[PDB]
Amino acid sequence: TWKLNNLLLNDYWVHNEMKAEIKMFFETNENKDTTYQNLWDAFKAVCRGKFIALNAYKRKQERSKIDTLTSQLKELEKQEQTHSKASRRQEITKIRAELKEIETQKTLQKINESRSWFFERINKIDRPLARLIKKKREKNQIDTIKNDKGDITTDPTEIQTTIREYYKHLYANKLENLEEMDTFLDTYTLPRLNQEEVESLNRPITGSEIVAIINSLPTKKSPGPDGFTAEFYQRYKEELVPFLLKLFQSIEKEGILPNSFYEASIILIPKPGRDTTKKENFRPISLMNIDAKILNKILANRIQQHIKKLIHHDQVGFIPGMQGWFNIRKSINVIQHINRAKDKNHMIISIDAEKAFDKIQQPFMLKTLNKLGIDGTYFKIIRAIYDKPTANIILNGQKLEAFPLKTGTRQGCPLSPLLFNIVLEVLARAIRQEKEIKGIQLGKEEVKLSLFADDMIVYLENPIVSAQNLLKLISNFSKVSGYKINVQKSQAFLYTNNRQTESQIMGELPFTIASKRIKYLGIQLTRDVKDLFKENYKPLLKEIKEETNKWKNIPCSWVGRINIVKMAILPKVIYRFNAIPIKLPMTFFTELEKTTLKFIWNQKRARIAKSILSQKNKAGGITLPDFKLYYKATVTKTAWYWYQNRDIDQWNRTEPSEIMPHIYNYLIFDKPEKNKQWGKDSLFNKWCWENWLAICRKLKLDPFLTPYTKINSRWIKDLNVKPKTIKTLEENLGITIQDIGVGKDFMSKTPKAMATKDKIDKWDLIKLKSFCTAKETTIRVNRQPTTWEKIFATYSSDKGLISRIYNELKQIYKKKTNNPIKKWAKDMNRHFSKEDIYAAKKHMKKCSSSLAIREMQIKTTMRYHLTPVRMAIIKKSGNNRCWRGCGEIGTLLHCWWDCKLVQPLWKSVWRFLRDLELEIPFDPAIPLLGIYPNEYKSCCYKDTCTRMFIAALFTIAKTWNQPKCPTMIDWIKKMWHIYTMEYYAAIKNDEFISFVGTWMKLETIILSKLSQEQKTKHRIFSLIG
DNA sequence: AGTTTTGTTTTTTTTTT
DNA sequence: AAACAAAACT
RNA sequence: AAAAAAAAA
DNA sequence: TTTTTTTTTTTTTTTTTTTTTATAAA
DNA sequence: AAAAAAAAAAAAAAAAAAA
DNA sequence: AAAA
Ligand SMILES: Cc1cn([C@H]2CC[C@@H](COP(=O)(O)OP(=O)(O)OP(=O)(O)O)O2)c(=O)[nH]c1=O
Ligand SMILES: [Mg+2]
Ligand SMILES: [Zn+2]
């Protein structure tokens, strides 16, 4: 079965022929003998045909010379068989060499192109580095399976039969009891879309809407069974979009899809931590055609606009703008309530749906859509999509016969996640409505359910009655929906006053009782909240230690190892902070940094100080992650939710009410409270507040009355003023006191405000007028806001909040450090200005795109290398002499510049610089640091000079302690290696005009100095000429 | 008149289901 | 994390 | 070796 | 209930002690 | 020579006692 | 070498 090889899309001739035939197919064929649904499948056939004809012809053309030479040679050598002739034996000898020459040159180019690709990526957070830490990928196979007979057997046809028959059976059984489905849907109260929303769903698809979905498709994904890639649609979107628009208009009008839209390829994924050999345990992941996914993406985006009307905020999975940590913190707060409660009769139950996406009954799903009020062209298209889907299973690369998908949503489809949620929402609403399933009461809050996708947790009081009624309702839902739970795999915490009472409830109920802990959404919930640190954070330290211990001999530098910590460790650390932001002891951070540094410096003491690595300005953009500042950024982030005061955030309201419940709405940018006994038992919120204050006083802010103080605040309420006035001001004029206006602008800022001014309750203006015009009020409110205050007040999106706060914290806590560039200036007798020190830092960033070349420069400037002077101090000795043996004292400036063994190389480089007909002083700061005197600071030739100098640095460093001269030829080899890596990358990225500028002059000079012997031995030949 | 800063956009990997 | 472009401050 | 949302660099 | 004193914790600064054996390539 | 760690000082918040 |  064919696939498009994306490499063909690059090639100038291939593109021109395809663009020509796409025009020619549609102009010829398009008429009313054909439906557009048929015509689209006919187009794809012709297009797949032409790619095959183009690929084959291209491959012939590339081989034509060796084709000819091999034919011509064998002809002459058969002439040898009758009579053996000297001149022919010469001619045969000549050509047989040239055949071997061409085969060599093709081989080398393939190696150099591969090395060039790796040279761009090395030590970067990219697929190569990610693959280095991971084990070898698998090619999925079956050779042994466990049989319907109960046998473990290995016959190839018997496995193909046993797999297919099993998956065919899973999807086969569609329910038929439509009248019972209606009865369940009438039993309960459900939302409805209104006429404006429904009109939005059914609106005509447009050409601009299609191109936006094409632009966003994920590159480097497998194609569907027809073998066209996302890269194809992106390449030809100019031709394809007019015809695609005609396709979707025809589907809207008729509700008939093309036959290919139904097709999908199942590949079998083994589930984590379970048997391969059981057919029981695989996940079927589907590949669909890209044209069908374009349509399905259109429909999913439309319904996503409305989804918050349909789905209650107890569901956070798949929902835009929601967070999984919302459910984790809510659940921990409920568990604390039970721990505190004097009379215990309570249960917490974790439930998961078995094969949830596969077992949804499609007729129930379509009835649900109508009941919510979705009908018209949108419902018509959804019904067509489910009319007859089929799968083929691809096993060991072989394509099995196809079966119908009569249950389930399509498990690799963009529309399937939302459709599953809408169906599950019918059960969620029914549980909330039913009052003999009793929730837990937390002051003014009742809590019953939290959902994440198909994952469900339930909070009950008086479980003996309440849990039985829950099970009964789920049975009724199962009969109509198809949804099913495994009750034994469902885990519960049970709380009772006596052991007798526990034994009764356990006897009656089907659930598994967890004494210590339940794993949930990535974390451990504990039966007592005291345990949170022990179960979550202590295990996380132990797991990081083992992980770095395995990696300890991995072959990358300290630069690459820093990136490994960022890529692999940092995400799981942040996730745990965000789920459970409890006060952590200082020893936790001490152990985490010791472990991480010991890995980066390969169990040897650091070569560069962690102080210098702290800031991006220093060390060329390599930065070490600060775990304490990430912890502070996560704890402080909660304050953004307190200021927003959103009705969806029930997780924030859930902490112990005991003295006073409202206070968190009043804390931020609002007046200090005398009472200091709120939050006595707070797990999260009290620690958040203490961190917020400490940062504000570090900044020397007054946090308590600000340009962002709300009208809905204690400041206005301690003025004893009627809520009708408060609401009037917000309705008319906006929410901040600065929107009212203070001092001389009290209402006068707009006519709309003075239009408001008369309206308000008579005496309350005199109260307001006094406060708003007071001398202290004008001073505090009129000041300019800081960047810190803008984070919490200004932004309507929680998006990207940890990264903003962390960037502020790094400036607030910015430390002083030693500068290596100053020590260089002392090793030489010279002063570097601020402009010189700026040039050194920029150069260390901009010397290359490759981290390989950048690392070498960074090590040179930052004084990485050991010296005899340093080593004699360490060993407590007086033998500080140059290791090369020239007899002088081994300072760092001796080792790089001044040693007589190194000096002949540097003079060689200055001879080339005269052949480029530059002129530069002979000054160690230019090649080692990148600091030029004030004339040459501008010059265009610096990119050439940078390549010459960094090549010299490599040559000297390679024989650092050796009693021999660095040679000129080793220097030319390095400079030619860099030239080669840059050439293939410059083509791949279409940069060849830049490349020719830098290298062209230098390349001519390198070739002029070598002999033909040397050029042959070291394979030095032009890639430009 | 010149350089630095701030924001958006395109590309990588990891977390949950 | 990088690059590019727009606006303000030195 | 596919889908959705979220997070960081 | 309010104000002042005392005690504890955290963060920053300064001084003292210890190191590593060459490096880049892989 | 250079980096890290330990020790001491300084400041602010919280608690208890007195006015 | 650490991809497709
Ligand atoms: C992990 C994962 C999940 N999904 C979707 C589709 C199903 C739901 C539920 O997945 P679940 O872990 O419950 O598994 P489930 O299918 O419900 O089977 P069991 O719950 O193990 O019976 O999430 C997916 O599309 N891709 C994935 O890689
Ligand atoms: Mg499930
Ligand atoms: Zn020397």
Side-chain angles (χ1 to χ4, degrees):
Chain A
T1 51
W2 179 79
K3 299 179 184 158
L4 188 64
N5 173 38
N6 281 341
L7 300 172
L8 283 159
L9 293 166
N10 291 123
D11 308 347
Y12 177 77
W13 175 68
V14 171
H15 182 84
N16 272 266
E17 293 281 18
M18 272 289 163
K19 194 170 177 68
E21 69 162 20
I22 290 172
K23 187 175 184 174
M24 189 46 59
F25 173 92
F26 280 109
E27 80 166 55
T28 310
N29 294 273
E30 191 171 5
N31 79 93
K32 296 183 196 178
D33 300 339
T34 48
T35 65
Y36 225 93
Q37 297 90 328
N38 286 4
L39 191 75
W40 182 258
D41 276 350
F43 165 62
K44 280 193 301 186
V46 169
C47 173
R48 174 169 46 252
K50 189 77 172 181
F51 277 114
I52 286 168
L54 295 176
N55 172 77
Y57 172 86
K58 179 197 173 188
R59 195 173 178 219
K60 184 186 176 182
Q61 182 154 108
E62 285 202 310
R63 207 180 180 257
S64 56
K65 183 164 179 182
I66 179 162
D67 299 322
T68 299
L69 289 181
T70 312
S71 302
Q72 174 189 107
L73 185 69
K74 195 179 178 184
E75 170 179 44
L76 296 190
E77 200 162 61
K78 202 158 189 173
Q79 304 197 328
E80 188 75 346
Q81 286 297 339
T82 58
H83 38 68
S84 172
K85 189 177 172 178
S87 66
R88 285 195 285 80
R89 208 186 301 164
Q90 297 165 342
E91 189 164 322
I92 292 161
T93 295
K94 186 180 171 179
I95 285 169
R96 192 163 280 139
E98 183 167 1
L99 186 144
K100 202 174 186 177
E101 181 59 39
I102 298 167
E103 170 163 290
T104 298
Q105 181 157 97
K106 287 184 182 188
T107 298
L108 294 189
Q109 171 159 2
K110 296 166 185 181
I111 292 168
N112 294 346
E113 287 174 348
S114 173
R115 282 173 175 162
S116 175
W117 178 88
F118 177 72
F119 172 87
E120 289 178 297
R121 288 162 189 74
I122 186 174
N123 295 326
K124 292 194 186 180
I125 295 164
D126 207 321
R127 205 175 197 81
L129 190 77
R131 206 157 187 282
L132 178 61
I133 68 175
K134 290 167 188 178
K135 297 190 185 180
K136 293 161 187 173
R137 285 275 291 137
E138 199 60 25
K139 277 287 178 184
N140 49 300
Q141 273 289 136
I142 302 290
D143 49 357
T144 63
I145 284 184
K146 287 192 179 88
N147 192 302
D148 303 325
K149 296 164 188 159
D151 285 32
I152 177 66
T153 47
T154 185
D155 175 22
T157 297
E158 199 165 357
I159 60 178
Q160 293 182 10
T161 289
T162 303
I163 279 172
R164 187 178 176 278
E165 293 294 349
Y166 173 59
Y167 277 100
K168 192 195 87 194
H169 172 250
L170 166 66
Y171 293 111
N173 294 337
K174 165 179 293 178
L175 292 183
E176 304 188 63
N177 55 326
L178 302 186
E179 174 262 2
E180 304 190 346
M181 297 175 181
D182 293 333
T183 295
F184 196 98
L185 292 172
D186 292 352
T187 302
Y188 297 102
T189 302
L190 300 180
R192 283 190 68 96
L193 297 185
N194 66 44
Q195 173 168 345
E196 186 176 315
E197 291 160 337
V198 168
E199 170 179 296
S200 193
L201 294 180
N202 296 325
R203 75 187 190 268
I205 296 165
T206 183
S208 58
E209 177 176 23
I210 293 166
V211 290
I213 290 167
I214 285 170
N215 292 338
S216 57
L217 294 180
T219 180
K220 313 177 195 170
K221 297 304 191 177
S222 307
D226 74 354
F228 291 97
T229 58
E231 292 82 23
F232 175 80
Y233 289 99
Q234 278 163 347
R235 196 81 179 94
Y236 297 97
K237 68 186 172 205
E238 187 182 57
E239 282 77 13
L240 294 189
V241 166
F243 307 120
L244 276 163
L245 181 67
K246 285 177 169 180
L247 175 67
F248 298 149
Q249 290 180 332
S250 196
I251 291 157
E252 286 176 318
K253 182 160 165 273
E254 294 158 16
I256 284 164
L257 300 182
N259 299 312
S260 68
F261 281 32
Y262 297 108
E263 299 177 344
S265 306
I266 285 173
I267 294 177
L268 295 173
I269 300 316
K271 285 177 179 179
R274 298 168 186 95
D275 276 304
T276 60
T277 66
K278 289 290 202 69
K279 70 187 185 172
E280 206 170 346
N281 295 338
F282 292 88
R283 179 183 296 293
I285 78 170
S286 309
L287 307 175
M288 295 171 59
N289 301 346
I290 306 309
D291 47 5
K293 281 174 166 176
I294 290 161
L295 178 65
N296 290 23
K297 190 63 172 180
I298 286 175
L299 308 176
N301 289 354
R302 286 181 181 203
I303 201 66
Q304 205 180 52
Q305 291 180 228
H306 310 302
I307 195 63
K308 281 178 175 172
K309 185 166 178 179
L310 307 174
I311 308 299
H312 190 243
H313 60 260
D314 297 327
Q315 168 67 266
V316 307
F318 313 133
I319 303 305
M322 299 295 281
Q323 314 279 323
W325 68 261
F326 296 172
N327 296 351
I328 301 174
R329 291 188 199 175
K330 185 164 80 186
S331 306
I332 293 169
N333 288 341
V334 175
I335 297 157
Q336 184 179 42
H337 178 78
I338 304 171
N339 292 160
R340 291 173 92 269
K342 279 150 184 164
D343 193 343
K344 284 172 168 70
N345 202 232
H346 298 83
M347 201 162 80
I348 298 172
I349 311 168
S350 189
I351 287 162
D352 195 274
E354 186 158 46
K355 304 187 187 295
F357 276 42
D358 303 325
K359 296 195 176 193
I360 295 307
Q361 290 291 342
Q362 296 166 357
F364 188 78
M365 185 282 280
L366 300 166
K367 282 175 174 295
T368 302
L369 296 181
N370 289 149
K371 193 73 177 182
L372 311 185
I374 297 147
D375 65 50
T377 66
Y378 186 93
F379 177 77
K380 173 179 178 169
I381 296 171
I382 291 180
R383 188 177 62 200
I385 291 158
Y386 281 87
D387 177 41
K388 63 217 183 181
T390 68
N392 288 100
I393 284 169
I394 301 189
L395 183 59
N396 306 326
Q398 191 158 113
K399 173 179 170 193
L400 310 188
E401 180 183 314
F403 56 88
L405 298 173
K406 293 177 175 170
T407 79
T409 56
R410 305 207 73 159
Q411 198 167 148
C413 183
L415 192 57
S416 167
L418 291 188
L419 296 177
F420 177 86
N421 272 353
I422 293 169
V423 176
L424 193 60
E425 188 61 14
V426 174
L427 174 67
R429 291 187 180 279
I431 296 157
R432 283 191 289 268
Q433 285 170 38
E434 172 156 52
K435 300 176 187 171
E436 293 316 314
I437 299 161
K438 276 170 166 55
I440 295 174
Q441 194 70 35
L442 308 178
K444 302 194 177 191
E445 305 300 335
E446 185 191 45
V447 289
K448 256 173 179 180
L449 257 57
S450 303
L451 303 181
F452 188 109
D454 77 315
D455 189 341
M456 172 183 289
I457 186 150
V458 179
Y459 315 111
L460 304 179
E461 185 168 3
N462 191 223
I464 202 167
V465 169
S466 190
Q468 285 161 21
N469 297 328
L470 175 76
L471 295 175
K472 294 168 208 159
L473 172 65
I474 291 164
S475 292
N476 297 346
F477 185 67
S478 289
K479 290 176 182 184
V480 299
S481 67
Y483 169 102
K484 190 243 172 176
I485 76 174
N486 190 321
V487 292
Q488 276 204 42
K489 292 204 178 193
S490 296
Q491 285 165 294
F493 294 137
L494 172 64
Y495 304 89
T496 67
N497 300 301
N498 311 285
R499 290 165 163 285
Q500 295 214 31
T501 311
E502 180 176 46
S503 299
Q504 287 172 236
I505 301 163
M506 288 176 166
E508 292 189 22
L509 288 184
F511 293 111
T512 282
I513 304 312
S515 57
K516 304 199 182 190
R517 62 191 176 108
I518 290 175
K519 186 162 190 174
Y520 176 71
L521 203 62
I523 66 75
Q524 309 289 312
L525 300 171
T526 61
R527 195 180 174 274
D528 194 325
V529 294
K530 295 179 313 189
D531 300 327
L532 286 176
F533 176 78
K534 182 184 72 175
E535 304 299 351
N536 296 274
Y537 286 101
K538 165 168 186 162
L540 176 75
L541 287 171
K542 191 184 175 179
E543 183 262 3
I544 294 162
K545 174 170 173 178
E546 291 168 4
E547 173 169 80
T548 63
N549 183 63
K550 287 185 297 193
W551 302 337
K552 66 182 169 177
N553 289 322
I554 282 183
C556 59
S557 64
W558 64 274
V559 182
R561 296 194 177 204
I562 287 171
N563 286 338
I564 287 164
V565 173
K566 288 189 179 186
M567 179 179 78
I569 294 156
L570 186 66
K572 70 174 160 183
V573 167
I574 291 183
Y575 185 88
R576 202 69 60 111
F577 291 162
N578 211 10
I580 314 183
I582 52 156
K583 191 175 185 188
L584 294 179
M586 282 300 303
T587 59
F588 168 92
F589 294 98
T590 294
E591 185 171 338
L592 180 63
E593 283 288 6
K594 184 162 183 164
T595 297
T596 287
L597 290 172
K598 183 186 178 71
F599 168 74
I600 290 153
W601 295 110
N602 196 12
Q603 309 193 344
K604 298 189 174 195
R605 87 184 286 162
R607 292 289 193 111
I608 301 169
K610 58 184 166 186
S611 311
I612 282 173
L613 292 180
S614 297
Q615 294 164 264
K616 271 186 166 189
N617 192 245
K618 301 176 179 174
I622 299 171
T623 298
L624 192 72
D626 190 346
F627 290 111
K628 285 171 192 168
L629 296 188
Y630 283 116
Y631 175 66
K632 277 188 182 168
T634 305
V635 171
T636 289
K637 177 172 63 66
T638 314
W640 183 97
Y641 296 83
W642 297 350
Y643 187 81
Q644 292 289 338
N645 188 22
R646 318 189 296 176
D647 294 311
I648 66 174
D649 291 316
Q650 200 198 24
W651 58 270
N652 192 42
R653 289 179 272 119
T654 297
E655 289 203 359
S657 310
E658 189 169 309
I659 300 185
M660 51 171 67
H662 310 280
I663 193 177
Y664 299 116
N665 312 302
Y666 294 110
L667 289 180
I668 302 306
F669 302 142
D670 192 8
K671 177 184 182 174
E673 185 157 352
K674 275 200 163 192
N675 189 306
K676 275 189 159 192
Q677 286 296 324
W678 66 268
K680 182 177 176 181
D681 290 306
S682 174
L683 287 165
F684 313 120
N685 278 338
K686 183 54 152 52
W687 180 243
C688 170
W689 169 251
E690 290 167 20
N691 280 257
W692 163 271
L693 271 187
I695 293 154
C696 285
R697 79 187 167 237
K698 187 78 183 186
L699 285 175
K700 306 169 179 174
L701 283 177
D702 173 19
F704 299 130
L705 174 62
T706 297
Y708 295 125
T709 293
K710 294 165 179 170
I711 299 167
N712 190 27
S713 62
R714 285 154 64 149
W715 284 111
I716 304 301
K717 292 178 189 180
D718 283 352
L719 317 173
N720 279 113
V721 163
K722 296 154 189 175
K724 196 173 182 182
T725 298
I726 296 174
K727 207 175 193 174
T728 293
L729 293 164
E730 294 183 310
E731 284 170 354
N732 291 266
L733 303 189
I735 74 155
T736 71
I737 300 181
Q738 200 191 85
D739 301 305
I740 297 174
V742 291
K744 278 187 170 185
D745 300 8
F746 164 52
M747 288 193 183
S748 81
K749 278 188 169 162
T750 61
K752 194 180 183 195
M754 281 187 176
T756 298
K757 190 180 178 187
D758 300 338
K759 297 178 187 181
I760 295 162
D761 187 288
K762 185 177 180 178
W763 301 123
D764 290 4
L765 258 60
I766 307 188
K767 293 160 178 172
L768 276 169
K769 185 216 72 170
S770 177
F771 168 86
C772 286
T773 67
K775 197 177 71 177
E776 197 64 19
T777 297
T778 304
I779 285 168
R780 297 164 84 177
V781 180
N782 273 337
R783 72 177 174 72
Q784 300 176 11
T786 65
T787 296
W788 178 258
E789 292 163 304
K790 284 178 185 173
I791 292 168
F792 296 81
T794 288
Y795 295 95
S796 312
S797 199
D798 59 344
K799 192 88 183 169
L801 200 55
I802 297 172
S803 82
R804 279 200 185 79
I805 296 160
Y806 179 88
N807 290 172
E808 263 285 357
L809 295 179
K810 286 205 84 70
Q811 300 199 333
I812 289 165
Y813 291 88
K814 187 190 296 177
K815 287 193 171 187
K816 193 175 69 182
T817 72
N818 301 308
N819 184 5
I821 298 150
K822 298 297 183 68
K823 297 197 166 180
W824 270 115
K826 165 178 170 178
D827 279 356
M828 314 175 196
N829 292 279
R830 68 198 298 169
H831 167 76
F832 297 134
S833 71
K834 290 180 178 179
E835 184 160 293
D836 288 353
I837 290 157
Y838 182 73
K841 291 175 179 177
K842 183 192 167 191
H843 179 79
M844 187 164 43
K845 279 174 283 167
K846 290 286 179 180
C847 60
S848 182
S849 60
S850 182
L851 285 183
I853 293 182
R854 270 170 61 203
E855 179 181 333
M856 179 79 264
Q857 185 60 81
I858 293 157
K859 287 173 165 179
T860 303
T861 299
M862 305 307 290
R863 303 170 68 90
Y864 180 96
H865 301 281
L866 297 174
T867 61
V869 158
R870 286 263 301 286
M871 207 55 41
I873 295 168
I874 293 173
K875 289 179 183 179
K876 214 75 171 186
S877 179
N879 191 242
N880 63 340
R881 294 288 153 180
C882 176
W883 285 314
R884 308 199 189 101
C886 78
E888 304 172 70
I889 295 174
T891 80
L892 188 66
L893 183 68
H894 182 79
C895 297
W896 285 118
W897 198 250
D898 271 337
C899 189
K900 67 171 181 163
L901 301 202
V902 164
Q903 277 281 308
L905 180 66
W906 287 118
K907 285 166 177 190
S908 308
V909 177
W910 264 252
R911 284 182 281 273
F912 284 59
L913 295 165
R914 272 184 159 204
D915 299 326
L916 284 175
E917 200 163 41
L918 312 181
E919 188 187 3
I920 306 184
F922 189 71
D923 170 10
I926 299 175
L928 304 175
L929 311 180
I931 296 165
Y932 286 81
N934 296 284
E935 172 163 55
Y936 317 102
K937 284 188 179 174
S938 63
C939 204
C940 58
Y941 283 103
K942 290 191 190 178
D943 292 339
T944 297
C945 287
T946 297
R947 281 149 181 76
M948 299 173 74
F949 300 142
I950 297 175
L953 303 183
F954 274 113
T955 311
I956 296 150
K958 211 182 186 184
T959 69
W960 189 247
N961 74 345
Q962 297 295 348
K964 67 188 190 182
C965 304
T967 78
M968 185 174 83
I969 195 66
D970 284 348
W971 174 60
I972 290 168
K973 292 178 203 155
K974 190 72 191 191
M975 200 162 50
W976 205 259
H977 174 77
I978 295 164
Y979 160 93
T980 299
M981 305 296 84
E982 289 195 328
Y983 172 82
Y984 292 113
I987 286 178
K988 203 154 190 163
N989 309 341
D990 187 15
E991 303 194 80
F992 185 79
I993 302 172
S994 167
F995 175 88
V996 175
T998 298
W999 290 103
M1000 182 77 215
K1001 294 191 193 183
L1002 178 58
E1003 189 199 287
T1004 311
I1005 292 163
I1006 296 162
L1007 298 177
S1008 302
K1009 295 190 178 173
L1010 296 166
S1011 71
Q1012 293 299 123
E1013 194 292 329
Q1014 287 173 315
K1015 293 180 198 169
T1016 304
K1017 187 178 180 177
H1018 309 295
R1019 307 165 192 167
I1020 298 172
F1021 52 80
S1022 183
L1023 301 172
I1024 303 176

